């Protein structure tokens, strides 16, 4: 029910400075989820301007095998938006266990990417978010690797 504001505010920009200049139309790609820290590598799509693909990655490398010349460099100016996989044992209110932590833990909860099937007692749950502060990322990983049903809860890439 809580599932625009980012694209309306990423338009506020200042978030990327491409080869010495910002203000260029751009967007973080869905195949890397670039994070503020370890810079990036940018590619120029025909329309929709620059397509950042996070520094070092295959699809970005595939482009190198087509029009590598178009590819460009940039930084971050000023950890919004990312996904996290939390494959875990069964559930038993575990869906609450993720959320229980997340609640007033603050961070955005638009990553309704769960998938409970497999063969064994191991539901595959994923979560895209739009966490703000980089420090917040760390507290989550410590508070989410802990969970008993959880066997893995870290930066999906």
């Amino acid at each position: 029910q809580l599932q625009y504001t980012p694209q309306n505010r990423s338009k506020d920009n200042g978030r990327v400075v491409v080869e010495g200049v910002g203000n260029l139309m751009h967007h973080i790609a869905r195949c890397c989820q670039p994070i503020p820290g370890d810079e990036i590598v940018g590619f120029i799509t025909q329309g929709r301007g620059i397509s950042v693909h996070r520094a070092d990655c295959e699809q970005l490398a595939e482009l190198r095998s087509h029009a590598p010349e178009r590819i460009v460099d940039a930084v971050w100016g000023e950890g919004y938006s990312l996904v996290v996989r939390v494959v875990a044992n069964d559930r038993s209110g575990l869906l609450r266990d993720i959320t229980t932590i997340l609640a007033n833990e603050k961070v955005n909860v638009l990553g309704v990417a769960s998938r409970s099937d497999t063969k064994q007692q191991l539901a595959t749950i994923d979560m895209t978010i739009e966490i703000y502060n980089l420090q917040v990322l760390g507290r989550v990983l410590g508070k989410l690797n802990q969970v008993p049903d959880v066997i893995d809860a870290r930066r999906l890439h």
């Binding site: 007692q121 191991l122 066997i151």
Partner: protein
């Protein structure tokens, strides 16, 4: 609750259980749990044992069930007079005769396996034993 996905005939004849097992060599994991007794494994017991054993090995190494219920044991609702047709497919079981492998496992220290099977077998009805894939 391991069980057949879309059968052929619904209810099945009781059928006496006799003779020895078949797949008697742990042909997958390095270690397995052979069965000595001669009883029937309810789908519940099997799966329950699976979770039992899996609890120990965390999730490292690898497992393999060697059986499968596939025999629709039927009961009759309580307080009903005999006859009037065979009852209802209450639950499924796999006939198990002496010497039948059940849970092959590997990738984990032999000791951890030897400990897990203690538990899994502990939940099983039929008396069982541990085994290792002796070459050929």
């Amino acid at each position: 609750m391991l069980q057949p996905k879309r059968t052929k005939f619904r209810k099945m004849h009781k059928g006496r259980n006799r003779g020895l097992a078949q797949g008697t060599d742990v042909s997958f994991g390095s270690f397995g749990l052979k069965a000595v007794g001669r009883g029937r494994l309810t789908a519940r017991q099997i799966e329950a044992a699976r979770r039992a054993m899996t609890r120990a090995v965390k999730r490292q190494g690898k497992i393999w069930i060697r059986v499968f219920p596939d025999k629709p044991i039927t009961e009759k609702p309580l307080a009903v007079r005999m006859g009037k047709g065979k009852g209802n497919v209450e639950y499924w079981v796999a006939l198990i005769q002496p010497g039948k492998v059940l849970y092959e496992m590997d990738g984990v220290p032999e000791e951890l396996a030897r400990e897990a099977f203690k538990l899994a077998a502990a939940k099983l009805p039929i008396k069982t034993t541990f085994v290792t894939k002796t070459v050929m």
